[PDB]
Paper text:
BZU3 encodes a [name]-Glc 4-epimerase and plays a key role in controlling cell wall synthesis during the morphogenesis of maize stomata. It also catalyzes epimerization of [name]-N-acetylgalactosamine ([name]-GalNAc) to [name]-N-acetylglucosamine ([name]-[name]), regulating N-glycosylation patterns of many proteins that may be involved in cell wall synthesis and signaling pathways. BZU3 formed a homo-dimer, with each protomer folded into two distinct structural units, the N-terminal NAD+ binding domain (residues 1-189) and the C-terminal sugar-binding domain (residues 190-355). The catalytic site was located in the cleft between these two structural domains.
To further address the molecular functions of BZU3, we solved the 3-D structures of the BZU3 protein, both in apo form and in complexes with NAD+/[name]-Glc and NAD+/[name]-[name], at resolutions of 2.6 Å, 1.25 Å, and 2.15 Å respectively. The homo-dimerization structure was consistent with in vivo bimolecular fluorescence complementation (BiFC) results. BZU3bzu3-2 failed to form homo-dimers, probably due to the frameshift which would be expected to alter the structural folding of its C-terminal domain. The maize BZU3 shared similar structures with the GALE proteins from humans and E. coli. The highly conserved NAD+ binding motifs (G13XXG16XXG19 and Y157XXXK161) of the UGE family were indicated in the aligned sequences.
Author numbering:
A (entry chain B): 7 to 200, 207 to 301, 307 to 347
B (entry chain A): 7 to 138, 141 to 201, 208 to 300, 309 to 347
């Protein structure tokens, strides 16, 4: 039983193939590796132990169609999990074509090769920046959508391409997942990343002088911004939950949308406190000049049979655990 | 002065490249003849006469990055008019990927080579189908993609707005238009695929026209859409390209409406064609406007032909070429 995972060498993707491997799956990963290193897949393989053999890695770009058609004709892939993409808001503005070319062309070629190789089961990882900054929280899947930046637009376009493909061929079964701010690392502290918590962690180890808190007078309990965080191990279990919805309850759902997350938001000060407790270090602050945004996960918990298991305190534990062991990444 | 025109071999593309050659512009046309035929460019060079020797034609696909960078490296360009694209709303639904591939990827590649070889002036052939209310559709009208072909147009219409934010040196004009009708008054070049259908009825290949919607909120009870002479459309882009050159400080990524500012019913157009052609159009029965005030104010452009000249030129090109080229 094989699953193909694009951008599997990345942060969310590497934690994905590990849980996949551990739960009896052959995982084929496709990565350009411009945003990551091979070591992450060598370590996810080690963490998988005897299941390390099941992981197969292809250093190939999703836009390359010939290299991609070869992969899809070498296995019957039960489904495809699409992580490949670029995830930098500031970078997407100065270089919008660089984002539109990578995200849009990469997905289109992917959807084409899949349809041509009889693989029409997809799970796409989408960003919850599509809701924009709304007046009302919690954000439900019925909330209106808007694009704050080219990165957000490129994500919202893919969602529309997925919807259009579904209406063109009812054989397509797509699940679109939206989520907020993955944080943490594998409890072993052997794989991890390389937003706020990264900045907190680099100043907790000494690399940075302090954490600058932007905004101290918001309409929140403490006055600092409230965002939606989610344990990365929890989020990588969310993408798998959808894959089971595709395997068991496929008939019910066609190109459905489930947004993931803990369901509650926490503030910068609430989050710094949760990291000082787990870390034992004390991050200095310097005060400088949306107040709240978070995801309503009621839908996911009901239809997808999924619920986050880890709170903010174990997120910082694991983040500190991996980072303190690996200060220079890989 | 050299202009690059993509999709210049078909209809609006063929007519515009003709009126660019006629105004002293060395024009390089890029087209992979998917929907058009090469004869349309040969016969455009003829109608240009002496200026016909300024038509450089490269049968290449915009999604072929290496083929495209050769064309930009040799010719030092001044601007690009992007007609290239797939227009069939019908198959855009059943084959959406084919549309996102050809349109989105072909456009993103062109934009990359342009900014690379130092040429950041573009005129885009958008579509007013992005309007998806109030009878006159202004540019500020809320945008609404109704199908995959419409969303490719709206996506490309957002990518340019994003490109301009990243590099202020980019000057772009987005031209939204709908329902081009007619051909060159000579009748030597035109469209070779509602007017095309009523035409085939007059020329005998079709038995009758099918009027879809005999009840509507209109005088005739039939739908009312906007129509613009293809020759009006062609030099409508010329007015845009004229703003990129003469007044390209004020403008950023501007969007303009091209049309006559008036709407025609279905029975009015067929009634018009029955006069201009003399042949009657049997019918078997089964509102969109353009706010041209902006374009005629800041572009110095107003459609010069009317619905009578559209059927005249369309019946002229069609009776002289009943089987295309
Ligand atoms: N060039 C290509 O087309 C291509 C091909 C194959 C793989 N890749 C790879 O895909 C990998 C993606 O991994 P990554 O570590 O950059 O991203 P990631 O693993 O942190 O996230 C995976 C995907 O989730 C998206 N995302 C949505 N909301 C997010 C949030 N709140 N935080 C973070 N990501 C969010 C990202 O845009 C990304 O596309 C990269 O390593 C890249 O090298 C690219
Ligand atoms: N090189 C490439 O990238 C590439 C690939 C495939 C096709 N093509 C070419 O693209 C050209 C497309 O031109 P065409 O022959 O369709 O002529 P056309 O005039 O119908 O289409 C060209 C432009 O006019 C617009 N248009 C015209 N009528 C319209 C209507 N009723 N509704 C909405 N928009 C309308 C379209 O938006 C399009 O951008 C063809 O000549 C084909 O050969 C180019």
């Amino acid at each position: 039983r094989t699953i193909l995972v694009t951008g599997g060498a990345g942060y969310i993707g590497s934690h994905t193939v590990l849980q996949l491997l551990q739960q009896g799956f052959r995982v084929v990963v496709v990565d350009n590796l411009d945003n990551a290193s091979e070591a992450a897949l060598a370590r996810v393989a080690e963490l998988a132990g005897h299941d390390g053999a099941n992981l197969v890695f292809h250093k190939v770009d999703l836009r390359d169609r010939h290299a991609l058609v070869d992969i899809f004709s070498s296995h019957r892939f039960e489904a495809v999990i699409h992580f490949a993409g670029l995830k930098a808001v500031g970078e997407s503005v100065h270089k919008p074509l660089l984002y539109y070319d990578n995200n849009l062309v990469g997905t289109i070629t992917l959807l084409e090769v899949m349809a041509a190789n009889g693989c029409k089961k997809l799970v796409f990882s989408s960003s919850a920046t599509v809701y924009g900054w709304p007046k009302e929280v919690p954000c439900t899947e019925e909330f209106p959508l808007c694009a704050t930046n080219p990165y957000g637009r490129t994500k919202l376009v893919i969602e529309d391409i997925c919807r259009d493909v579904h209406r063109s061929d009812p054989d397509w079964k797509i699940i679109l997942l939206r989520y907020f701010n993955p944080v943490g690392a594998h409890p072993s502290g052997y794989i991890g990343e390389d937003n706020l918590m990264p900045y907190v962690q680099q100043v907790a180890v000494g690399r940075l002088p302090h954490l600058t808190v932007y905004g101290t007078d918001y309409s929140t309990k403490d006055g600092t911004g409230v965002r939606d965080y989610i344990h990365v191990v929890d989020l990588a279990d969310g993408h798998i939950a959808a894959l089971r919805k595709l395997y068991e309850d496929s008939d019910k759902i066609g190109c459905e949308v489930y947004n993931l997350g803990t369901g509650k938001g926490t503030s910068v000060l609430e989050m710094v406190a949760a990291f000082e407790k787990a870390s034992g270090k004390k991050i200095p602050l310097v005060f400088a000049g949306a107040e709240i945004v978070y995801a309503a996960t009621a839908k996911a918990e009901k239809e997808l049979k999924w619920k986050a298991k880890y709170g903010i305190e174990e997120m910082c534990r694991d983040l500190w655990n991996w980072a303190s062991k690996n200060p220079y990444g890989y």
